[PDB]
Amino acid sequence: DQAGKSPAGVRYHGGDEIILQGFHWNVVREAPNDWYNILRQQASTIAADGFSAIWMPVPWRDFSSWTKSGGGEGYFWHDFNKNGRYGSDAQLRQAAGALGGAGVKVLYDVVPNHMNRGYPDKEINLPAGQGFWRNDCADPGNYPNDCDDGDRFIGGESDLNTGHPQIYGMFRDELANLRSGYGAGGFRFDFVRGYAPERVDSWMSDSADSSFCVGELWKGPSEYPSWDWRNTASWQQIIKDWSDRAKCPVFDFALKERMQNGSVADWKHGLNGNPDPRWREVAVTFVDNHDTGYSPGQNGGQHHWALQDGLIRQAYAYILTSPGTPVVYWSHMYDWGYGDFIRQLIQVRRTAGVRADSAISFHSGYSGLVATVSGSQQTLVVALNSDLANPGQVASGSFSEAVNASNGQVRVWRS
Numbered sequence: 515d516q517a518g519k520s521p522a523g524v525r526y527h528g529g530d531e532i533i534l535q536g537f538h539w540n541v542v543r544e545a546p547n548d549w550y551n552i553l554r555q556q557a558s559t560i561a562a563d564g565f566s567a568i569w570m571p572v573p574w575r576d577f578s579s580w581t582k583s584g585g586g587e588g589y590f591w592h593d594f595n596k597n598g599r600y601g602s603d604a605q606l607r608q609a610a611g612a613l614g615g616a617g618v619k620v621l622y623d624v625v626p627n628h629m630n631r632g633y634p635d636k637e638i639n640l641p642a643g644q645g646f647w648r649n650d651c652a653d654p655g656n657y658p659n660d661c662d663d664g665d666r667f668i669g670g671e672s673d674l675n676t677g678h679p680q681i682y683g684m685f686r687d688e689l690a691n692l693r694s695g696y697g698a699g700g701f702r703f704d705f706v707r708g709y710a711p712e713r714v715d716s717w718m719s720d721s722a723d724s725s726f727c728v729g730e731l732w733k734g735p736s737e738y739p740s741w742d743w744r745n746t747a748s749w750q751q752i753i754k755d756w757s758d759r760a761k762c763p764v765f766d767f768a769l770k771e772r773m774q775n776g777s778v779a780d781w782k783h784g785l786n787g788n789p790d791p792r793w794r795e796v797a798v799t800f801v802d803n804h805d806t807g808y809s810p811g812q813n814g815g816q817h818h819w820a821l822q823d824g825l826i827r828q829a830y831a832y833i834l835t836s837p838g839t840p841v842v843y844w845s846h847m848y849d850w851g852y853g854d855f856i857r858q859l860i861q862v863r864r865t866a867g868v869r870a871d872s873a874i875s876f877h878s879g880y881s882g883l884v885a886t887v888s889g890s891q892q893t894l895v896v897a898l899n900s901d902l903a904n905p906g907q908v909a910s911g912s913f914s915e916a917v918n919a920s921n922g923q924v925r926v927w928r929s
């Protein structure tokens with residue numbers, strides 16, 4: 515495992531990560547108070563499957579509830595107490611220790627934008643009228659105000675002023691706490707549209723400068739005002755700008771948007787396909803997460819933007835053979851039977867030496883997507899939903915078959 519920032523100072527931890535999202539939306543209901551125990555038991559298997567990192571659920575306890583129904587998943591935490599719906603503080607420490615001991619770095623989902631302000635019994639009690647909250651200032655709509663330099667969560671009544679020195683420090687200290695006491699190797703920043711990207715850079719510089727990080731910016735061009743350059747920009751440009759300012763990798767919602775709306779050929783327009791290595795190397799690619807995807811359990815989870823099953827294998831073959839840093843969703847890997855296929859693709863990635871900044875060229879003249887990827891050890895030819903017959907049609911050199919699945923709809927050859 516190589517460490518190191520990118521040439522532009524972006525915290526992609528060497529560019530060689532392969533990440534497991536270590537939960538789905540309904541874990542707190544499907545395995546009540548037992549998830550950390552399960553992760554501890556599974557740590558050696560996760561490592562053997564080839565993952566270098568695991569994205570853990572929000573560790574801050576969440577006892578919220580609403581009615582569809584939900585609550586408790588971590589995105590409406592009420593304080594930093596770790597005794598929540600995934601397991602106890604002791605069980606978290608044991609799971610993080612087992613994962614780290616198996617060689618899997620532990621990334622915590624953190625949620626600075628808001629908290630369960632109204633929960634009656636909590637350790638963090640911030641009064642009104644001291645600038646701690648967005649709505650201490652006038653709040654006319656979903657955009658920055660004088661107490662919140664980002665967007666708001668729903669009505670904004672629970673948004674924190676993360677730029678207030680006491681609130682900034684509160685999160686700074688808790689990130690340090692996760693690093694010193696809970697084995698954190700990095701962080702996944704939730705809802706980064708809600709606060710300034712430079713604050714993520716500051717938090718990471720203060721508390722985890724050499725760690726991995728990734729931000730979730732999910733905000734399309736149409737959500738920006740008419741006078742903002744982002745209103746007419748590409749999804750790539752929007753997330754890349756965030757990454758530049760946070761000095762942090764960013765989830766590749768440009769690729770996700772193309773997977774949901776475009777053809778397979780169009781997947782080349784994700785951030786991770788950009789010919790500038792400074793652009794593609796900061797992409798964190800994924801197929802679905804706990805928001806976009808289904809989960810086992812009530813209501814099938816959230817499934818706000820889910821990839822149809824006829825493209826799941828193709829999508830994993832693309833992200834696991836291509837540049838950027840790939841994330842595998844728990845339920846594809848361990849609930850729904852794609853594990854053996856994903857295991858094989860992870861081995862292909864590692865054997866070829868594909869990294870976040872590997873070159874990728876796209877080839878015209880065939881159906882579907884045809885790419886050549888320059889790994890540090892091998893060149894890959896990847897053909898998805900394509901009438902390509904053999905790799906010699908598009909690449910020089912000697913190749914052998916590495917993957918052939920879904921009646922040839924997923925084919926990968928290696929030098």
Ligand SMILES: OC[C@H]1O[C@H](O[C@H]2[C@H](O)[C@@H](O)[C@@H](O[C@H]3[C@H](O)[C@@H](O)[C@@H](O[C@H]4[C@H](O)[C@@H](O)[C@@H](O)O[C@@H]4CO)O[C@@H]3CO)O[C@@H]2CO)[C@H](O)[C@@H](O)[C@@H]1O
Binds near residue numbers: 667669670671704
């Ligand atoms: O005071 C603020 C608001 O409080 C109340 O809001 C409710 C919502 O109505 C519920 O839907 C729910 O919200 C969930 C949300 O549905 C869910 O998707 C998730 O959001 C995450 C996301 O998964 C994550 O990856 C990233 O994008 O950030 C998102 C936000 O953290 O989690 C939400 C919180 O559990 O719960 C809230 C709070 O109870 C009230 O109804 C609003 O009117 C009010 O403005």
Ligand SMILES: [Ca+2]
Binds near residue numbers: 515516526527531
């Ligand atoms: Ca690394």
Ligand SMILES: [Ca+2]
Binds near residue numbers: 665666673
């Ligand atoms: Ca906010």
